[PDB]
Amino acid sequence: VAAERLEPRVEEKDGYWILKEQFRKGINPQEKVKIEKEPMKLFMENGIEELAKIPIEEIDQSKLTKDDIDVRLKWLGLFHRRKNQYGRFMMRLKLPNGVTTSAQTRYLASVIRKYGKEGCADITTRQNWQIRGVVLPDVPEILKGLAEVGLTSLQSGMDNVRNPVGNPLAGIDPEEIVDTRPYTNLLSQFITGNSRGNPAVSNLPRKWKPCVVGSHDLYEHPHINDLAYMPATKDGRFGFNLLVGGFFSAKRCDEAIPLDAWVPADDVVPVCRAILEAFRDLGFRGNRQKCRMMWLIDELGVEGFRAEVEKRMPQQQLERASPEDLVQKQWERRDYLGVHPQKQEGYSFIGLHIPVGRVQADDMDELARLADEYGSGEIRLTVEQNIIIPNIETSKIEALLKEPVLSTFSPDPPILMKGLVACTGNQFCGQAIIETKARSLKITEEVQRQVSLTKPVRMHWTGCPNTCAQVQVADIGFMGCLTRDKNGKTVEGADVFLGGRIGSDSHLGEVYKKAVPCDDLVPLVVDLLVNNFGAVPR
Ligand code: SRM
Ligand code: SF4
Ligand SMILES: O=N[O-]
Ligand SMILES: [Cl-]
Ligand SMILES: [Cl-]
Ligand SMILES: [K+]
Numbered sequence: 068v069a070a071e072r073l074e075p076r077v078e079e080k081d082g083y084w085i086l087k088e089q090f091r092k093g094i095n096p097q098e099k100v101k102i103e104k105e106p107m108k109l110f111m112e113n114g115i116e117e118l119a120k121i122p123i124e125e126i127d128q129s130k131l132t133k134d135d136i137d138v139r140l141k142w143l144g145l146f147h148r149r150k151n152q153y154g155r156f157m158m159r160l161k162l163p164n165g166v167t168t169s170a171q172t173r174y175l176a177s178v179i180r181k182y183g184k185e186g187c188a189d190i191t192t193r194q195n196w197q198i199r200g201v202v203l204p205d206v207p208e209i210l211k212g213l214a215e216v217g218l219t220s221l222q223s224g225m226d227n228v229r230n231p232v233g234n235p236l237a238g239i240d241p242e243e244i245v246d247t248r249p250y251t252n253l254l255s256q257f258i259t260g261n262s263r264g265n266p267a268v269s270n271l272p273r274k275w276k277p278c279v280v281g282s283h284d285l286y287e288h289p290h291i292n293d294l295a296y297m298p299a300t301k302d303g304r305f306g307f308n309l310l311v312g313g314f315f316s317a318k319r320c321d322e323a324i325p326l327d328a329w330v331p332a333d334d335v336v337p338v339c340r341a342i343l344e345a346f347r348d349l350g351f352r353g354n355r356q357k358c359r360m361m362w363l364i365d366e367l368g369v370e371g372f373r374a375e376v377e378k379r380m381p382q383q384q385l386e387r388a389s390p391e392d393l394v395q396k397q398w399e400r401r402d403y404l405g406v407h408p409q410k411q412e413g414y415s416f417i418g419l420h421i422p423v424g425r426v427q428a429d430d431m432d433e434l435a436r437l438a439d440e441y442g443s444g445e446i447r448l449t450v451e452q453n454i455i456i457p458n459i460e461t462s463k464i465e466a467l468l469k470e471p472v473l474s475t476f477s478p479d480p481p482i483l484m485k486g487l488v489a490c491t492g493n494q495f496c497g498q499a500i501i502e503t504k505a506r507s508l509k510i511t512e513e514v515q516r517q518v519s520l521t522k523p524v525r526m527h528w529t530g531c532p533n534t535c536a537q538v539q540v541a542d543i544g545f546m547g548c549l550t551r552d553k554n555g556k557t558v559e560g561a562d563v564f565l566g567g568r569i570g571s572d573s574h575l576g577e578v579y580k581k582a583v584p585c586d587d588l589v590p591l592v593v594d595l596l597v598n599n600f601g602a603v604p605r
Pocket of ligand 4: 224
């Protein structure tokens with residue numbers, strides 16, 4: 068690799084970071100959008116105010132403004148549902164470590180309630196909230212309301228740092244390694260510039276996902292993150308070994324690899340900055356399918372990339388990885404659903420199953436009420452699109468278990484539901500090939516009616532090859548496709564994946580059977596469970 072290759076490709080200009088003229092040749096259309104107008108201006112210069120006043124039919128008549136609503140607004144966490152819900156926007160937060168409050172939950176509920184049949188909310192596979200039904204004229208008021216309850220939606224889509232994932236049991240688990248909340252909080256504050264916006268990290272070549280590990284269970288899925296902080300002592304000091312480049316895409320899935328670097332705990336933000344700066348400065352900006360950070364690591368080599376991180380550290384020093392970390396390989400991932408004692412004596416947390424992560428406004432109000440009446444007003448989201456309500460006096464549990472809402476959001480659902488994960492799918496997502504959420508519930512219900520089991524089999528349903536529901540981590544994964552019935556008629560189908568493992572001995576699953584009609588999945592899955600996971604016919 069030439070020294071020429073290491074020339075930073077972006078420069079700061081008027082508070083924003085833009086591609087240098089000499090590196091603009093051959094860029095993808097999204098890069099052209101970012102050059103034509105800096106997306107962060109919609110927030111940081113209040114461009115949203117004037118944009119929100121223009122009727123959508125008029126917005127659609129010019130490239131600049133159509134790109135505003137279809138692309139640039141994703142820097143404000145707003146996602147136009149052009150194909151499947153025209154004129155309406157999904158909105159996605161920053162929610163480091165999945166931690167929310169009853170006040171925030173009620174606020175989000177009040178927004179979606181306004182939109183009636185066009186509104187609902189979802190828990191995401193990055194332990195985050197999404198809301199639906201948002202109309203453009205309401206955006207300025209929603210941004211204000213979010214700020215008032217201590218939320219931001221900044222930089223949650225497109226070429227930005229995505230939600231920082233942590234340990235859902237942070238601070239409450241007797242068995243935790245390190246409380247991940249301070250670190251995920253610090254990362255979120257850094258990424259979003261304390262909710263004001265941080266242009267230094269908003270013009271990446273592509274999305275980029277961080278997590279901080281605090282559990283032996285590895286609830287955080289470090290193996291699939293662009294940066295994962297693995298807790299580790301080095302030379303008598305607490306810090307993190309760093310894994311880099313993990314990602315999924317339609318083209319390629321790759322597990323994170325060691326950077327061969329360790330940082331003391333206080334260097335979490337400096338190293339996140341250094342890595343993001345290296346990626347921003349040096350990343351390829353052509354074919355979008357070759358823009359994720361792992362591709363830069365492949366081009367430079369891990370040592371080449373490491374040197375670029377090192378040069379961007381304060382005092383330009385980066386220690387080598389510590390030989391061992393604090394994560395025990397001897398571990399069985401713990402089921403967090405149900406009632407469990409906290410490390411604080413006299414207190415319990417409860418894990419509640421949220422069927423395919425979908426909630427309506429009334430459901431959100433009920434969950435917020437439970438958190439206030441029984442806990443401390445806190446609600447935690449998980450990457451299996453479930454919830455935990457922590458900080459419940461254990462003496463209140465008998466009463467809690469009698470709450471009617473717990474029949475819908477159960478602390479002890481059937482075992483197959485506990486592990487069921489499904490992406491948005493074609494109810495709202497324009498990329499989706501099939502319907503996912505309703506289908507996956509119906510199929511899982513019919514399968515569990517036929518078999519009993521004891522192994523916690525994890526089933527993931529994703530609507531297209533983008534694999535937002537991570538089918539490659541599943542015991543049994545289902546990827547949307549169109550296929551053919553016995554009469555050659557078009558029907559919805561799934562490619563079925565097997566082999567995904569999580570925790571310390573992680574592994575990426577692969578396609579086992581292509582193009583199975585959805586209507587034929589029940590018998591296939593019943594047999595797989597009996598034949599491979601010890602399930603017993605009922
Ligand atoms: C909501 C969520 C799935 C869910 O039901 O939980 C989701 C939904 C979408 N993802 Fe994703 N992704 C979600 C996690 C994922 C993950 C899983 C993860 O982060 O662990 C991945 C695979 C892991 C990865 O990227 O490394 C995933 C891979 C993608 C990709 C393909 C990435 C690539 O490099 O090719 C796209 C398309 C793209 O960016 O080009 C995408 C794009 C999309 C969009 C924004 C596409 C669009 O505008 O319609 C989806 C919005 C649909 C909607 O209305 O909800 N989504 N997306 C997740 C939101 C996470 C969050 O809170 O930030
Ligand atoms: S996997 Fe495909 S269908 Fe599902 S939310 Fe992601 S982009 Fe949409
Ligand atoms: O929107 N998930 O990259
Ligand atoms: Cl996006
Ligand atoms: Cl769309
Ligand atoms: K769930």
